[PDB]
């Protein structure tokens, strides 16, 4: 049985300051054991009896205890449209994973015309594939991997 | 593509605008200095570099 605290990693609301009002916050979680656990041999944990269940997920929000008069001054400023907050993704990026066949040597790339205004470097590395699915549904029970991704 | 049109929207999204202490109200910039030691606002605002 486990107890863990899990942070928000999304680069638009992980450092945001949120003013008075009522909000609806929802975030979904993954119960696939090949995506939430790591293995030392990288052996599949869905051909083994690993499983997980969640019972109760709370949110803990920690409030700075403002003086009321100062709080409302702060709010008023940040209700102005000239004091809009502004964030950027740390790896500000667009990710394209082009397939490399087995025993291939050369890998052409086709990129349809775009504007290249305000572009920065290419950055690249070679992965490894054939096992586990991709992000979007995080399941597919014909699993074959569980090690470091 | 065409003739420039991305420049005003880089002064809006702070990709090539002016400094943070210079697009914010002087009241909020005074507040952010005064409270710096215990309630940092600095990371909430982009500063451009070109």
């Amino acid at each position: 049985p486990f107890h863990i605290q899990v942070p928000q990693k999304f680069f638009a609301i992980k450092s945001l300051l949120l003013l008075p009002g009522s909000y609806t916050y929802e975030w979904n979680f993954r119960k696939d054991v090949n995506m939430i656990l790591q293995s030392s041999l990288g052996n599949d944990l869905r051909t083994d009896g690993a499983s997980i269940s969640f019972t109760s997920i709370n949110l803990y929000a920690t409030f700075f205890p403002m003086a009321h008069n100062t709080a409302s001054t702060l709010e008023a400023m940040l209700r102005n449209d000239t004091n809009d907050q502004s964030f950027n993704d740390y790896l500000s990026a667009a990710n394209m994973l082009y397939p490399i066949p087995a025993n291939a040597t050369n890998v052409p790339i086709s990129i349809p015309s775009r504007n290249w205004a305000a572009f920065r470097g290419w950055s690249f590395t070679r992965l490894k594939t054939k096992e586990t699915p991709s992000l979007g549904s995080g399941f597919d029970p014909y699993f074959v991997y569980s090690g470091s991704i | 593509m065409a003739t420039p049109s991305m420049l005003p929207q880089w002064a809006y999204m702070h990709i090539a605008g002016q400094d943070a202490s210079e697009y914010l109200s002087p009241g909020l910039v005074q507040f952010a200095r005064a409270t710096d030691t215990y309630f940092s606002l600095g990371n909430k605002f982009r500063n451009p570099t070109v």
Binding site: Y90 | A20, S21, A34, G42, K44
Partner: peptide
Amino acid sequence: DINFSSLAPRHGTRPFMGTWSDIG
């Protein structure tokens, strides 16, 4: 350079008689 930047051209202005630089 994969990176961020923040409000930094302004500084903690406080005196050695108060840890808070006032606000009008």
